[PDB]
Structures are given as C-alpha cells and as structure tokens.
Enzyme design. Structure first.
Site, mmCIF file in Angstrom:
data_model
loop_
_atom_site.group_PDB
_atom_site.id
_atom_site.type_symbol
_atom_site.label_atom_id
_atom_site.label_comp_id
_atom_site.label_asym_id
_atom_site.label_seq_id
_atom_site.Cartn_x
_atom_site.Cartn_y
_atom_site.Cartn_z
ATOM 1 N N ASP A 117 34.125 36.583 33.064
ATOM 2 C CA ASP A 117 33.345 35.370 33.282
ATOM 3 C C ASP A 117 32.167 35.221 32.319
ATOM 4 O O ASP A 117 31.585 34.143 32.235
ATOM 5 C CB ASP A 117 32.812 35.314 34.714
ATOM 6 C CG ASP A 117 33.880 34.961 35.734
ATOM 7 O OD1 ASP A 117 34.832 34.225 35.397
ATOM 8 O OD2 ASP A 117 33.763 35.421 36.888
ATOM 9 N N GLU B 200 32.567 42.847 44.470
ATOM 10 C CA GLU B 200 31.935 41.927 43.519
ATOM 11 C C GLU B 200 30.670 41.416 44.196
ATOM 12 O O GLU B 200 30.728 40.564 45.077
ATOM 13 C CB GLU B 200 32.864 40.755 43.154
ATOM 14 C CG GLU B 200 32.371 39.874 41.991
ATOM 15 C CD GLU B 200 31.373 38.803 42.423
ATOM 16 O OE1 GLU B 200 31.760 37.860 43.140
ATOM 17 O OE2 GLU B 200 30.186 38.917 42.071
ATOM 18 N N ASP C 283 36.548 39.517 44.629
ATOM 19 C CA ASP C 283 35.618 38.519 44.119
ATOM 20 C C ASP C 283 34.945 37.774 45.261
ATOM 21 O O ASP C 283 35.610 37.349 46.216
ATOM 22 C CB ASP C 283 36.474 37.576 43.219
ATOM 23 C CG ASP C 283 35.702 36.546 42.413
ATOM 24 O OD1 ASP C 283 36.360 35.851 41.560
ATOM 25 O OD2 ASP C 283 34.468 36.377 42.552
HETATM 26 C C1 LIG Z 1 35.808 34.901 40.846
HETATM 27 O O1 LIG Z 1 36.303 33.673 41.431
HETATM 28 C C2 LIG Z 1 35.922 32.463 40.794
HETATM 29 C C3 LIG Z 1 36.269 31.287 41.714
HETATM 30 O O2 LIG Z 1 37.679 31.142 41.796
HETATM 31 C C4 LIG Z 1 36.593 32.473 39.422
HETATM 32 O O3 LIG Z 1 36.351 31.235 38.767
HETATM 33 C C5 LIG Z 1 37.275 30.877 37.742
HETATM 34 O O4 LIG Z 1 38.513 30.421 38.311
HETATM 35 C C6 LIG Z 1 38.421 29.215 39.054
HETATM 36 C C7 LIG Z 1 39.791 28.903 39.642
HETATM 37 C C8 LIG Z 1 37.886 28.105 38.130
HETATM 38 N N1 LIG Z 1 37.906 26.777 38.731
HETATM 39 C C9 LIG Z 1 37.328 26.445 40.031
HETATM 40 C C10 LIG Z 1 35.852 26.120 39.895
HETATM 41 C C11 LIG Z 1 35.331 24.884 40.043
HETATM 42 C C12 LIG Z 1 33.840 24.679 39.873
HETATM 43 O O5 LIG Z 1 33.142 25.912 40.009
HETATM 44 C C13 LIG Z 1 36.181 23.685 40.385
HETATM 45 O O6 LIG Z 1 35.747 22.558 39.632
HETATM 46 C C14 LIG Z 1 37.644 23.939 40.070
HETATM 47 O O7 LIG Z 1 38.432 22.892 40.624
HETATM 48 C C15 LIG Z 1 38.092 25.275 40.649
HETATM 49 O O8 LIG Z 1 39.493 25.409 40.432
HETATM 50 C C16 LIG Z 1 36.486 28.484 37.650
HETATM 51 O O9 LIG Z 1 35.922 27.480 36.801
HETATM 52 C C17 LIG Z 1 36.604 29.795 36.889
HETATM 53 O O10 LIG Z 1 35.308 30.211 36.497
HETATM 54 C C18 LIG Z 1 36.004 33.634 38.623
HETATM 55 O O11 LIG Z 1 36.613 33.775 37.359
HETATM 56 C C19 LIG Z 1 36.232 34.946 39.354
HETATM 57 O O12 LIG Z 1 35.564 35.997 38.687
#
Ligand SMILES: *[C@@H]1O[C@H](CO)[C@@H](O[C@H]2O[C@H](C)[C@@H](N[C@H]3C=C(CO)[C@@H](O)[C@H](O)[C@H]3O)[C@H](O)[C@H]2O)[C@H](O)[C@H]1O
Length: 499
Positions: free
Chosen positions: A394, A340, A293
């Site tokens: 996602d 990705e 990713d």
């Molecule tokens: C590829 O990677 C992405 C980034 O990690 C992932 O995103 C999902 O998992 C994250 C952990 C989650 N939270 C983070 C995102 C934020 C804002 O964009 C912050 O506010 C949070 O504190 C972080 O922890 C994402 O919201 C979630 O979409 C993708 O799933 C993956 O494909």
C-alpha cells in the site's frame, strides 16, 4: 506461534518474472524460493490469493476460499497437449490485466476442453475427488462464476430474483444447464490448489514459511455473500444497507469508503462463527501464518450508511473479537495470525491483539514525520513480537517515498539512522539504509518488498490506495533480482543475528 529472529521478502506471485503475461505457480516461483533461501531468508509474504474482478485488487475477491486462476501456470497443461500457447505480446515489467483477461481465460477454457478430451482416468478421478472434498464452498463458487456468463457479468444481487434468492429449483436448473461452465471453474480451482500445494511443499523443503493475507471484510459481489445473505447487512434486494470503511483521519480528510458488506456479528455468533473457522482453515492449508487486514475491525468497525458517498458519516459498532478469538484458540490450539494494526488504534484493539499473542506491524516510512513515534525501532516492544517493513504493498517504494518526503522527515531520518550507525551518500541508497535499520531492530521479523531490494522508484509501486486504476501490476524482469542482491541480503542478516 513462536517467531524466530529472521528476515523475509514481500512478493505477490503475480510479480514473478516469466512468460505469458503474469507471474505463475511454476519454475520462476521455485527459482525465487531458491533465491530467498540462498539469501538467508526464512519468510515469503504474499497478498490474498483469490480471484479478482474490477480493479484487480487481491482484497476484493469473488470468493473468500477460491484461488486466482491468473496464477495458474499453463506450461504443464501445454506439456500434456491440452492447449497450445502463443504469446500475444505481453509487456515487460508489468501485468496488462486487459490483455491477461482477453488471453488467459480463453487459454484456460481451451486447456479444460483438452483435458476433457485427453486426460487419464486417474486425473479425472483426482479432479472429481477434489470437487467432492471442496464442495462446501466450491459448488457455490463455480455456479456463481458460471451464472456471470448467463447474466452479462452482473453482480449476484442484480440477477433475476429466483437465482438471486437461491430458490431450490432455480439453482438445480442452473446447475444442470451450466454443468460445463461449473466444471470449468472447478477445474481452475483444482489446478490452482494443486500448483500452490506443490509450491508450498518446495518452500517447506527449503525451510521457508509463507505469510498470507486476508481482508477482514469480504466483497459485496462474492459467492459467499450470495449463498449466506443472512450473515450480512443487506436489504431485501441483496444490496448493502451499510458499508465498511474508516472515518476521517490525520491523513485522510473524508476517510475511506471501502464499500464492503458488513457482518451481522450476532448472526455469526449464533451460527458458531463457522465462516471464520473455515476461512482460517483454508488459509492454513496455503500459509504458515496469515495477516488479517484491518484487524481492529474485530473489536469495532466504522459503519457507513450506504447512501453516504464518503466515510464522514457513520458510527462505531462493537464486534465480538474476544469471543471469536477464544473460539479460534480453543479449536485450533493456537492463533497463527498477524495483526494489521496500522492507522488509528485504541487500547481495546491493542489488548485483543496482545491477549492472543498476535504480532503487530511496524512501517518505517511512517516513523520520521514527528522520538515518541511508535514506528521508530527504539519504541518497539521489548519482546519484539512485531514485523517491521520499510513499506507494504500500500506504500510507495522507499525510494519513491523518500523523493516526496518532507524536509523535516528527510533530516530526522538521516539523524536517526546515524544514531544507529547507518549512513548513506545518495537517495538511491535510502531503501537499503532503512532495511538495515529494520534488521538492527528488536523486531523478530523484518520483511521487505522486493522493489526496495532493487531500490526502484515510484513506477514500481504496487498499490496507491484511492486510485482505482494502475495497481497490482508491477513485475520483476528476468534476472533482475540478482545473486549479488541475495549476497547483500545474506550479509545484512548475518550482521544482525537474523541467520
Ligand atoms: C487492506 O484492505 C484494503 C481495503 O480493501 C485494501 O485496499 C485496496 O484494495 C481495495 C479493494 C481498493 N478499493 C476499495 C477502496 C475504496 C476507497 O477506499 C473504494 O472506492 C473502492 O470501491 C473499493 O473497492 C483500495 O483502493 C486499495 O487500496 C488494502 O490494499 C489492503 O492492504
């Protein structure tokens, strides 16, 4: 890697049906692999398999190496008399992570005490042997998790300094005092990797390859950051001075502030990139190929100052992707990585990807909002070294996406599909129409979320980025994925030279 022309399905193991509140690495997992083989499928894609914390996201794990104790099937432990299982009343079709947390951790701890009481010498020595084999990450992971129970669940960079800074005496005393808790976490790991190994062998016997996943950046609150703070941009208190994310976009107005610690790539290079070699080794123990990713982060990453509440402020910083992947190719003899490469990608990123022959991705939900759109099948590479999805974890389900799509998207989609001979009468047919389109394309691999096989609406969406809650919870019901679904998938694969 050589990619055959084939199809697969995207299904995170938590989404499997079965008792006790979450999908596990047991009979229903084997039943799904049997379904997949009988459907003509050759690939099973999952999300990262590590232990989760707040938000339940596979992409923010307590360890880059550990496996998720929630995926452990407790039934074999109950069969050996280690634990007695009683269903508290888990919901149908979704993981309740609060109830799972409250019921499964204690069930695992009971099972551990039962094992300490009743296990054969053979099992005990096999467990000790595992611990010796995996010590290079497991000692740190198990102690990290144990220390959370001594410090109210605090992250490592809020622990008392002697422990935060890993003073030799502090750690030795902690390891002795928390020996039982350390052993318990090691035990969850032994069980995970044993059960995953068995499942991987079953996939292999059925001719199925497993596609895994990992985030490029690791989590702030994780055992490896704690153990190797020098590899990251942290202040003296162990807090990130800068954080990961992506800048404002066509889609996002303020961008995304992910918050992950950022690598000091100069330090990783001087150290020989051992972290990356170990990560990929571990990935390849579990998977046949692995997606990374935010692959573009190997070429350059958006550095956000930690004081900034959004991703608007920052700068691009180059990373030694070319050097890293040369080392990987040299030392592995191949690069079994999927890139990705969604969102905003540059020529420099494309070149890195193509230099090492890494397949990229295509998402059909993105293809209809503007004929030069790269997500339209006629624009895919002539070689077809790409993986096409309707949507990923996602995205909304394809029916959910269609129901909120713009008039111009819907109209263009219908006409583009007709250009490929594909037609439909009702909106519930759109998921299968798009799956057909992806299968007709030159993409070597077409991989579809199971929610689209079932034509489910937005309630079955796996993750909605930005939203911190409600995610990673969708589950199959028993018998929902039917033999007729498998027959339909097989017919489509047979019709598109994918069997
Ligand atoms: C590829 O990677 C992405 C980034 O990690 C992932 O995103 C999902 O998992 C994250 C952990 C989650 N939270 C983070 C995102 C934020 C804002 O964009 C912050 O506010 C949070 O504190 C972080 O922890 C994402 O919201 C979630 O979409 C993708 O799933 C993956 O494909």
């Amino acid at each position: 890697m050589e990619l055959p022309r084939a199809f697969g399905l995207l299904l995170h193991p938590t989404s499997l049906p079965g008792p006790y509140g979450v999908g596990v690495l047991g009979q229903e997992a084997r039943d799904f692999l049997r379904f997949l083989k009988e459907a003509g499928g050759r690939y099973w894609q999952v999300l990262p398999l590590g232990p989760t914390g707040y938000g339940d996201s596979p992409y923010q794990s307590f360890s880059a190496f550990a496996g998720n104790p929630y995926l452990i099937d407790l039934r074999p432990l109950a069969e050996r008399g280690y634990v007695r299982l009683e269903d508290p009343g888990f919901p149908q079709g979704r993981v309740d992570y609060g109830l799972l947390y409250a019921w499964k951790w204690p069930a695992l701890k009971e099972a551990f005490r039962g094992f300490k009481e009743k296990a054969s010498p053979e099992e005990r020595e096999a467990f000790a042997a595992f611990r010796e084999r995996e010590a290079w990450w497991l000692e740190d992971y198990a102690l990290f998790m144990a220390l959370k129970g001594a410090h109210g669940g605090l992250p490592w960079n809020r622990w008392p300094l002697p422990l935060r800074k890993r003073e030799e005496k502090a750690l030795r005393e902690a390891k002795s005092a928390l020996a039982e808790e350390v052993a318990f976490h090691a035990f969850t790991q032994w069980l995970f990797f044993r059960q995953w190994g068995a499942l991987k062998a079953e996939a292999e016997a059925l001719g199925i390859r497993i596609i895994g996943d990992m985030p490029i950046f690791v989590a702030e609150d994780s055992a490896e950051v704690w153990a190797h703070p020098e590899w990251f941009h942290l202040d003296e208190e162990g807090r990130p001075t800068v954080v990961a994310g992506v800048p404002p976009d066509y889609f996002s107005e303020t961008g995304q502030r992910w918050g992950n610690p950022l690598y000091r790539w100069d330090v990783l290079e001087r150290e020989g990139f051992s972290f990356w070699i170990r990560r990929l080794e571990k990935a390849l123990e579990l998977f046949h190929l692995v997606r990374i990713d935010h692959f573009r982060g190997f070429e350059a990453y958006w550095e956000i100052p930690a004081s900034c509440p959004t991703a608007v402020e920052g700068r691009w910083v180059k990373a030694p992707g070319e050097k890293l992947f040369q080392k990987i190719q040299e030392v592995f003899g191949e690069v079994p990585v999927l890139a990705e490469d969604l969102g905003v990608i540059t020529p420099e990123v494309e070149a890195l990807r193509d230099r090492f022959g890494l397949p990229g991705m295509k998402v059909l939900q993105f293809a209809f909002d503007x004929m030069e759109n790269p997500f339209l099948p006629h624009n895919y590479p002539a070689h077809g070294r790409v993986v096409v999805y309707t949507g990923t974890h996602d995205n909304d389900t394809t029916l959910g996406w269609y129901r909120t799509a713009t008039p111009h998207e819907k109209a263009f989609m219908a006409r583009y599909l007709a250009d490929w001979g594909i037609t439909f009468r009702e909106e519930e047919e759109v998921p299968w129409a798009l799956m057909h389109l992806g299968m007709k394309s030159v993409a070597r691999l077409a991989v579809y979320p199971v929610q689209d096989v079932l034509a489910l609406g937005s309630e079955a969406r796996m993750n909605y980025p930005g939203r911190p809650s409600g995610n990673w919870a969708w589950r199959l019901l028993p018998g929902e994925l039917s033999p007729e679904h498998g027959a339909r998938l097989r017919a489509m694969a047979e019709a598109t030279e994918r069997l």
